[PDB]
Each structure stands twice: as structure tokens, then as C-alpha cells.
Write a protein that binds this ligand. Structure first.
Ligand SMILES: CCCCCCCC/C=C/CCCCCCCC(=O)O
Length: 133
């Protein structure tokens, strides 16, 4: 059900990431470096366990989870959140909760590209990834 998402993906477009980061309280210097990074996202599965790596010249993260089962996560910007990832309408929907706040990270495949939509507050960022062979 999550198979088309699997593989190695490289960032090729980003819209409103600064707005999203600023909404989360990320400092200007971090936003500045992040605005010039092009991460690689690697999504792998082993049975019911997905592992999602995000690699860059700036920061790296890795999470492992089962769909539909809450997990603790420490984000790239050091938020300690309660997370859950599901499939909804064919999209991979990652919801993070902390301090009564929420943000969603929604991934969907359009014409073979992976679109990541990040929403926090009123900020909506769209990042496009292309698959590495
Ligand atoms: C791990 C790569 C880090 C990139 C720099 C991020 C700076 C700190 C910002 C944190 C806010 C949360 C961002 C989540 C999305 C990361 C980029 C993406 O996967 O397309």
C-alpha cells in the first residue's frame, strides 16, 4: 500500500519552506542554511516497519515507525513530538503533536514525483522530490 513511496528521493523544488520554518520558531541562521540545502529522503520498509531517512549537508534525521502506531520523534529543529503516520487517500500523512500544537507532513505521488506538503499554523510549504535510480 506504501510501495510507490519507497526509494531514494532528491529535492528539486521548494515553495514557502521559510514560512513553515518561521512558523515553527526556527531561527534565522538555521532558516538561511536550510533554504539552500537539498535533502535526500530515503524511505524503506521491512515488513510493517518503515524507516524514513532525511540526509543533507546540514542536518540528518531518521525515524522508524509502523503505520497507524504512535511513536516518539525528535525533529530536525529539536521538537519532541508525538507522531503517527497513516495512509489516507493514497497519501502518506504524518501528524506531529507537541505542546497542544500540530503540524502535518503529507506526501503524495503526482506524475512519479513525490510532493511533500508541510502545514503549521497558516503556513503551507510544498516541496517536490524526484526519484533517484
Ligand atoms: C534533515 C534535513 C534538514 C533540513 C533543515 C531543516 C531545518 C530545521 C527545520 C525544521 C523544521 C521541520 C522540517 C521538516 C522537513 C525537513 C525537510 C524535508 O524533509 O524536505
Amino acid at each position: 500500500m506504501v510501495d510507490a513511496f519507497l526509494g531514494t528521493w532528491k529535492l528539486v523544488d521548494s515553495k514557502n519552506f521559510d514560512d513553515y520554518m518561521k512558523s515553527l520558531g526556527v531561527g534565522f541562521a538555521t532558516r538561511q542554511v536550510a533554504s539552500m540545502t537539498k535533502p535526500t529522503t530515503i524511505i524503506e520498509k521491512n515488513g510493517d516497519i518503515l524507516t524514513l531517512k532525511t540526509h543533507s549537508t546540514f542536518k540528518n534525521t531518521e525515524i522508524s515507525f509502523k503505520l497507524g502506531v504512535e511513536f516518539d520523534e525528535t525533529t530536525a529543529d529539536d521538537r519532541k513530538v508525538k507522531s503517527i503516520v497513516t495512509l489516507d487517500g493514497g497519501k502518506l500523512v504524518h501528524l506531529q503533536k507537541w505542546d497542544g500544537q500540530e503540524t502535518t507532513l503529507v506526501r503524495e505521488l503526482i506524475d512519479g514525483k513525490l510532493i511533500l506538503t508541510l502545514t503549521h499554523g497558516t503556513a503551507v510549504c510544498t516541496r517536490t522530490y524526484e526519484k533517484e535510480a
